[PDB]
Each structure stands twice: as C-alpha cells, then as structure tokens.
C-alpha cells in the first residue's frame, strides 16, 4: 500500500455541484498526512474518531470522500443531526457519524472572482434526506398546496437555485470547498488501507 491519490481530490480542478456531491472511494493504499501538507490553508477541520492526520499511517477498509462546494455559513451545517437547507435537500450524514469533514475557502479555484453560477442547490422537496441519500436531478417541482403542470406554475417552484456571479460579499458567500472523509470499519481481509 503506497501513498494514496488522496491529495489529488483536495488539489483538484473540478468540484461538482452540492446537489451532485461526488462520492469517491479510496482503498488499497496508505493515506498519510505527508501526501498533502505543503499547502495547509484549510479553514476548518472536524473529526469524530481517529483520523489519517491524527495517526500518520492508519488503515481502513472503506474510505469514501464526499466532495462538493458550498458557501461559508452553511459549512456549519455539515454535521450529524443538522437541519435546514443544505442538510435537508442536498446532503445528509448519519446522526451516528464517525468520520471527518474538511472545509477550505477559495474564490479563485472556481476560475472566477465573482464566483460561479454553475454550482446549484435545491431548496425543499417535501421530506428531508435521512443519512446518505441523493434524489436531486434536473426536474420541475410539482404542486405543494395546489397542483400544476410543468414550468413555474401555480404554487410551483424550480427546485434548483443558482449562486451569485457578482463579486462576493465576504467569506460568508465565498465558495468553500468541502470534503467529508466519512469512513467505516467492517470485517474484511487486511492489506486494504485508506
């Protein structure tokens, strides 16, 4: 198990929209903190239980990274039991969570000083996501108190809203990159690491 490509995800050139957060998996490699520490400008760290950075060399069976981009304040909502907007209709993590979430601010990694409007977010779908789930796709939200037929009809919205393209009003509206390093351990053969 050599050094992982773990550093490529953080130093990547593309990040999918939050509603289409990328669920990548890494296995059969040792993920050290020496793989990416030369550009340590990470705004926020959180971890529940031992982390690859806490133990330089540490192995896991199933390590999966949930990668996406979201504005500043809502980064607070990436935590078990959180509710509201992003935590209810774009991403959700189990209330019994044993993993890590890493958030770092950037305003030029999206290739624009006024941010991008290509990273959308969904508001309201009726019923909120419970643990890891995804049901968000380009579609028209129907009814809610009165039925309609397509488009933005009588009491019907478009589920996806776009972030701004004008200059940001501070870090609060800047596109923070977020990678949730949720990992789990289960009975498996060894020499699998993450």
């Amino acid at each position: 198990t050599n050094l992982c490509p773990f550093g490529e995800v953080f130093n990547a050139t593309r990040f999918a929209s939050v509603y289409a957060w990328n669920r990548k998996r890494i296995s059969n490699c040792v993920a050290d903190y020496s793989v990416l520490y030369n550009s340590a400008s990470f705004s926020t760290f959180k971890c529940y239980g031992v982390s690859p950075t806490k133990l330089n060399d540490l192995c896991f069976t199933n390590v999966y990274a949930d990668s996406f981009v979201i504005r500043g304040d809502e980064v607070r909502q990436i935590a078990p039991g959180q509710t509201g907007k992003i935590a209810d209709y774009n991403y959700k993590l189990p209330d019994d969570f044993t993993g890590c979430v890493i958030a770092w601010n950037s305003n030029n990694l999206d290739s624009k000083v006024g941010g991008n409007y290509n990273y959308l977010y969904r508001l309201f779908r009726k019923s909120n996501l419970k643990p890891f789930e995804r049901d968000i796709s380009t579609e028209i939200y129907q009814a809610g108190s009165t039925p309609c037929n397509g488009v933005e009809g009588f009491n019907c919205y478009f589920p996806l809203q776009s972030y701004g393209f004008q200059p940001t009003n501070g870090v609060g509206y800047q596109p923070y990159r977020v990678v949730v390093l949720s990992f789990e351990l289960l009975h498996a053969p060894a020499t699998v690491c993450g």
Partner: nanobody, 127 residues
C-alpha cells in the same frame, strides 16, 4: 525492530494438515496485530489470515475462509497457522508479518498493512 522466525512447512499431501509457527523476538510481541501472507513464484503477496492485536477477532481470505485456523499465543509469544484441507495451488512461501502499533497505532475492526516481514517458510502441497 522485530525478528520473525517461521518453523514448520515442507512437503505435505493434498488434504493433509500442517502447522506454521511464527515466533517473534525484540519489541513486545503482544502489542502488535499479526497476519499470514502467501507468495508463490507465480503470484504476488496475498492476504491469508489475520489476528488482531487483542486476539479477539480473526480475518480470513476468501480462498481459505473456513479452512485455515489462525491463532495467537501471547504467553508463548507465537502465532500459529493450522493449515488443513490443502490443495496443490496452496504451494508458496508463507510469511508472517507484524503491524507496528508503537509507531503508527491500530484499532482492529479491519486494519493493518504489516511493515515487518519474516524470513518465510516453503510449503509444497503434493498429492
């Protein structure tokens, strides 16, 4: 560091029984998780079996699950691999490896890329 010595092996019949003994010397043996790997001249290192540092959970490869028995004796400072129900394809040099806990630490639910490897013992299953 640790020194791992393998004893046993040799020529055995298909469906016979052998016991490979891995004895460790040096730093405390009881604080490490251990495993057996096989490497034949025609295959690369594959995980055979694993016993945690606490010897309360055992992991087996898909090819040898329910056929090989891996056990640990901390008092004797030893790891025993009872090999039974053998086939000619099991021929290989068997290595016992210990995963460092002092340097990097471990928590057994499923872990370990063993950093110390023993001399190896030849096992030839001939019917």
């Amino acid at each position: 560091q640790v020194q791992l010595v393998e004893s046993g092996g040799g020529l055995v019949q298909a469906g016979g029984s052998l016991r490979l003994s891995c004895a460790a010397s040096g730093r405390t043996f009881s604080t490490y998780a251990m495993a057996w790997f096989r490497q034949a001249p025609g295959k690369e290192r594959e995980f055979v079996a694993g016993v945690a540092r606490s010897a309360d959970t055992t992991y087996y490869g898909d090819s040898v699950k329910g056929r090989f028995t891996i056990s640990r004796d901390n008092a004797k400072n030893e790891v025993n691999l009872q090999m039974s129900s053998l086939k000619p394809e099991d021929t290989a040099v068997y290595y016992c490896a210990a995963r460092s806990v002092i340097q990097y630490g471990i928590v057994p639910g499923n872990d370990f890329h063993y950093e110390y490897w023993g001399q190896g013992t030849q096992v030839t299953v001939s019917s």
